[PDB]
């Protein structure tokens, strides 16, 4: 019975963990596009 709860806890953890990875990805890619945006704006 511990198992079902624990399994249930992991499933409910997936989206919040996934959305947090995605957020990390977006910050990473925003960081990579930022000096490009700057060069465009400085012309």
């Amino acid at each position: 019975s511990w198992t079902v709860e624990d399994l249930q806890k992991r499933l409910l953890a997936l989206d919040p963990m996934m959305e947090q990875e995605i957020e990390e990805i977006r910050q990473k890619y925003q960081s990579k596009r930022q000096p490009i945006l700057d060069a465009i704006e400085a012309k």
Binding site: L7, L11, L14, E21, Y29, I36, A39
Partner: protein, 46 residues
């Protein structure tokens, strides 16, 4: 990288490339979590 050396259309293209890479990366991630989920949902449904 001295981005100022590139033309506007070159810089725009790099942005399109990065946008495509970012979506692909997010896809990889959604897919990874989908496989964890199916294994979990199987165990739960048992």
């Amino acid at each position: 990288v001295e981005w100022d050396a590139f033309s506007i259309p070159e810089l725009q293209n790099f942005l399109t490339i990065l946008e495509k890479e970012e979506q692909d990366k997010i896809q990889q991630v959604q897919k990874k979590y989908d496989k964890f989920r199916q294994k979990l949902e199987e165990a739960l449904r048992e």
